[PDB]
Amino acid sequence: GLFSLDRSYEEVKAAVQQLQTITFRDATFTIPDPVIDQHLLIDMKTACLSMSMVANLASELTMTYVRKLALEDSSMLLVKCQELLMRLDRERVSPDDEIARLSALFVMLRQLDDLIREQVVFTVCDVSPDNKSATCIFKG
Amino acid sequence: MAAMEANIFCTFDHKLSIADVGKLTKLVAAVVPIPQRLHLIKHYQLGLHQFVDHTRGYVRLRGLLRNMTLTLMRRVEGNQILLHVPTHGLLYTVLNTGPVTWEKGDALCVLPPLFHGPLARENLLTLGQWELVLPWIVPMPLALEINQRLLIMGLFSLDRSYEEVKAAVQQLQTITFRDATFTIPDPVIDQHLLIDMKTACLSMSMVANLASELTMTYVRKLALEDSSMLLVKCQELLMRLPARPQHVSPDDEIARLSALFVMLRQLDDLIREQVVFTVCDVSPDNKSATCIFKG
Amino acid sequence: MSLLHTFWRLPVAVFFEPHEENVLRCPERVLRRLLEDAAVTMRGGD
């Protein structure tokens, strides 16, 4: 989905064809491309847009808080965190708007929640030539 | 030693009245927390009242309630109470007590009680400066909103004036959800919120460091060739500023995405409450529901 | 001026008792006193 806007180049299309084929236990199959009719469907569009927005909001917001909280941090971990943020900076607001951006970051994370994690529903214990079936215990 | 008890009998070490036993009978099928499983316990260890304290923090109360044991109320006898600690995955009948509407099919969470409207109801059990405050069973969206707003208050408090933080806390306090408004009591920035702030800062910084230029530039590229209320709204929330992508490697991209998924799970767990029940029924008066216990 | 070059660009607040890890704390008063005492010892040192 993220590559969906660079599909004019052959390098990108080869990248997608590599993404598309997957290999597992003695089987290979090709998953369908989320781009059909040259444009990306609205649900995948929202998933990608939310991912990119949470990344972008973190990139700008986190430094201000990391400075202040790293001053206090007895773990000496947040100082290293601020150092890493300074590094990524080097490679390249009204209070209500700060509230708005923090709310946006967390709402985008909630938008990602469906994809970020998936539930286990069974665990397997049975083997046969009949492999079409197995016995499993159910999990909710 | 002694195996863990499932059915727990509770006795009131206080002269009960008729009205006390009545408003105690109304609580059948309610979920009450207890700190210690024992066959016969005393009523002092019933509910949240033992934990209310001069600290007055809401986050402290949430943290204390998380580690408690949840049990369901069974039939009431004169001055005696029976509680049953549920098993995972079974079906149970659950009563709601907070004025928050439930819907058929949503997830439920345990959080300390809020206050609603005029705060006109306090006719619960009082017995000699003891109270039966039960926790609120709320659907997941409201729980996420509460935790998110507490974390946002805490983060905003850093390097903002005392009065600026006052105004922000005032506005973030008030939540509207399913056409009813609730207010958080006592949002207080203790150390319990300070740990959450520290991990939120670390998680955001690791997200920013892990996110690739493809991930960053998707929003910008979409804005150049697509337009919608979603996009214009989210870009209005954002800073202001063809050609080929200069680095392309699916294997690097998937490794980076997997690590970023771990970090995004780290950040989500701050606002994400543990589901205790899943609903599939509502009484049309919305007083009770039949639920699957998830603990 | 900046006579020490450090790999890290930010310093950290160091905890724990001095018997766990080595730290070079010394105020300038102590250093000046030590320097002059060493000078007189060197004077005390065909």
From Swiss-Prot, chain B:
Domain of life: Viruses
GO molecular function: structural molecule activity
Pfam families, per the entry: Herpes_V23
Keywords tagged on the record: Capsid protein, Host nucleus, Virion
Localization (cell): Virion; Host nucleus
InterPro entries: Herpes_capsid_2 (IPR002690)
Keyword Transport appears in the UniProt entry: no
Regions annotated as coiled coil: none
Annotated Gene Ontology cellular component terms: host cell nucleus; viral capsid
Principal subcellular localisation of the protein: virion
Subunit comment: Interacts with TRX1 and major capisd protein/MCP.
Family: Belongs to the herpesviridae TRX2 protein family.
Reported function: Structural component of the T=16 icosahedral capsid. The capsid is composed of pentamers and hexamers of major capsid protein/MCP, which are linked together by heterotrimers called triplexes. These triplexes are formed by a single molecule of triplex protein 1/TRX1 and two copies of triplex protein 2/TRX2. Additionally, TRX1 is required for efficient transport of TRX2 to the nucleus, which is the site of capsid assembly.
HAMAP family per the UniProt record, alphabetical: HSV_TRX2
Name under which the protein is recorded: Triplex capsid protein 2
From Swiss-Prot, chain C:
Subcellular location: Virion; Host nucleus
Annotated stretches, region: Interaction with major capsid protein/MCP: 1-45
Assembly and binders: Heterodimerizes with CVC1. Interacts with major capsid protein/MCP and triplex capsid protein 1/TRX1 at the pentamer vertices. Interacts with the large tegument protein/LTP.
Family: Belongs to the herpesviridae CVC2 protein family.
General function of this protein: Capsid vertex-specific component that plays a role during viral DNA encapsidation, assuring correct genome cleavage and presumably stabilizing capsids that contain full-length viral genomes. Participates in the interaction between the capsid and the tegument through interaction with the large tegument protein/LTP.
Stated name of the protein: Capsid vertex component 2
UniProt source species: Human cytomegalovirus (strain AD169) (HHV-5)
Protein encoded by which gene: CVC2
